[PDB]
From a paper:
Sialic acid-binding Ig-like lectin 15 (Siglec-15) is an immune modulator and emerging cancer immunotherapy target. Siglec-15 triggers a signaling cascade through its positively charged transmembrane region after association with the immunoreceptor tyrosine-based activation motif (ITAM) adapter proteins DAP10 or DAP12, regulating several biological processes including osteoclast maturation, bone remodeling and susceptibility to fungal infections. Ligation of Siglec-15 suppresses antigen-specific T cell responses, and monoclonal antibodies (mAbs) that block the interaction of Siglec-15 to its binding partner(s) promote antitumor responses and are under evaluation for the treatment of several types of cancer.
To assist the crystallization of the extracellular domain (ECD) of Siglec-15, that consists of two Ig domains (d1 and d2) (Siglec-15d1-d2), we employed the fragment antigen-binding (Fab) of an anti-Siglec-15 mAb as a crystallization chaperone (clone 5G1232). This non-glycosylated Fab was produced by cloning its variable heavy (VH) and light chains (VL) into a Fab scaffold containing human constant heavy (CH) and kappa light chains (CL).
Residue numbers in the entry:
A (entry chain I): 1 to 52, 52A, 54 to 56, 58 to 74, 76 to 82, 82A, 82B, 82C, ...
B (entry chain M): 1 to 48, 50 to 214
The structure:
Amino acid sequence: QVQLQQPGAELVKPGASVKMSCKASGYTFTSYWITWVIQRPGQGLEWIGDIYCGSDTMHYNEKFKNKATLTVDTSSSTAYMQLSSLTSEDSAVYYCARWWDYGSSYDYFDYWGQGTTLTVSSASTKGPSVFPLAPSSKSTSGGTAALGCLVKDYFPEPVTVSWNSGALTSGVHTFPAVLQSSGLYSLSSVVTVPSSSLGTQTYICNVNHKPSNTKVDKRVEPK
Amino acid sequence: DIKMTQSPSSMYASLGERVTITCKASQDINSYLSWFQQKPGKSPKTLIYRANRLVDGVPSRFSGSGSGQDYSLTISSLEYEDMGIYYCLQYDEFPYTFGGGTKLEIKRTVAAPSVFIFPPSDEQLKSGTASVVCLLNNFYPREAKVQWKVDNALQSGNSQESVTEQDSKDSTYSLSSTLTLSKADYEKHKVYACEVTHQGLSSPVTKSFNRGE
């Protein structure tokens, strides 16, 4: 079972350094290559550098030299890419991907990581307040009822909002967060559920904001 | 150093349509080109390597072609799961360079929005603010106009909207508008509405509610 684990997000103060981990598990670690890719949101992709976990033989990008330093830990079977002299420009998403038969003519990316949403800012982090979007008479449409949770007044993104600890997936809607005039983010996560089951079922939204290390689970009910 | 230019950058398409996109290289990369496909906010997936060979798990409808400078990626019967942005990556020369991206958006029949509206939570009023949410679920196309009205008076200056990506199952967009007022000003008015004017509706759809209820 091949698996590559990247952290959800990393908050960085500007000018300081940070490390992004890409923990490989379930396969022979020291027999493959790993490649890092940066994606600034809405734009294209950019190659950072190819790294071999087991000879430290690298292949750097010319524009990323003097900026990125790649590392491998054969103990934890984990790859590491360290960034130095971090500015407001380097705030983007960084991927890690595995090569298959790198060097040969049949090489390609066979497994991808989730990606680290790196945001560089000097402001301090603030935890979110979660408010229930209760179902009402104005919240139903033909046997279907909509309920949700409003995640408001937090910084920075991203926040992960699951329902019933992941037990309910069909018909969930997590909207993109908007930037408040105060400098904070806020979004809503709504789900369309049957109306007849509103008296017997329980709908608990599991909001998780790891950058502030606060996890709120708010139960939403009618009225 | 090598520049990859794709076309079209953005494009619509129907279901089952045979769509092809191109990835032209600034040099001769000798068929060393791979096709990637990514969904909004998620990890990319490898579709084709060396421009003509399928990865395990890739549907049989994805096809690759091309040689020298020009290459193509074709889908036999476009389905609601093939949306997203497609990137091509040449890996013949250092450094590797991607393309500008190809956003594939699905065209379907006109759909009317399911308009909902939620009153502000009781816990929020204990803090001093009031957030009224007007909800638009499962509509297409994306272009929709929402207008907030309090006590039949049009309001502008305190509303924030947000529309999600195109749905992977129903190929629809969903919008959420947030109206935030102070606790005192929310308790100053009685009827709070949001006017939803959209193409899929011949007449504006209004969902209102009173404070007391």
